Design a protein around this ligand. Structure first.
Ligand SMILES: CCOC(=O)[C@H](CCSC)NC(=O)NCc1ccc(N)cc1
Ligand SMILES: [K+]
Ligand SMILES: [K+]
Length: 164
């Protein structure tokens, strides 16, 4: 079945809880596999210890720049960037998990979790999963953002991995 993965998130070193995500390997196998492997750290790099660097209330929580920590870096398990796999899944509401990018065919490691329906990103960002449990944790993260995206606390993925 589709992988179930988790992120354990803290804010200035205080635990906020766990976000559980389903990855749609049945629809975007290569995108799902990248995220899955970055959660386990099995390639020797990934999300553990990195931050949510850009968090905009009523929009989304963005993370996965584990090289530069500011939205300019990250890398995939395939190399620095990989193509847009397809745009089959849509940004249908809060809890959608989608790939950040800098234009067509620039997927790396950065990703976002939507806190509203972000339909204007349909056909532009590759959707690959959704929140199974811990939308209340996502809302806590959202609470530390701002309209600019700057966070008021350091929001850290303290642990991550695969459940099934
Ligand atoms: C809500 C998601 O927002 C984004 O993805 C914005 C979009 C700027 S318009 C291209 N981009 C960004 O924050 N960051 C740019 C970026 C750079 C390299 C990779 N591998 C991924 C992303
Ligand atoms: K806006
Ligand atoms: K800094």
């Amino acid at each position: 079945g589709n992988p179930l993965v988790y992120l354990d998130v803290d804010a200035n070193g205080k635990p906020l809880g766990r976000v559980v995500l389903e990855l749609k390997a049945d629809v975007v196998p290569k995108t799902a596999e990248n995220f899955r492997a970055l959660c386990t750290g099995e390639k020797g790099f990934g999300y553990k210890g990195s931050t949510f660097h850009r968090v905009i209330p009523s929009f989304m929580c963005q993370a996965g720049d584990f090289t530069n920590h500011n939205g300019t870096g990250g890398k995939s398990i395939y190399g620095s960037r990989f193509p847009d796999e397809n745009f089959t899944l849509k940004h249908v509401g809060p809890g959608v998990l989608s790939m950040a990018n800098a234009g067509p065919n620039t997927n790396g490691s950065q990703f976002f979790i939507c806190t509203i329906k972000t339909d204007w990103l349909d056909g532009k960002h590759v959707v690959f999963g959704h929140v199974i449990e811990g939308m209340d944790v996502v809302k806590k993260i959202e609470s530390f953002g701002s309209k600019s995206g700057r966070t008021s606390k350091k929001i850290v993925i303290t642990d991550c991995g695969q459940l099934s």
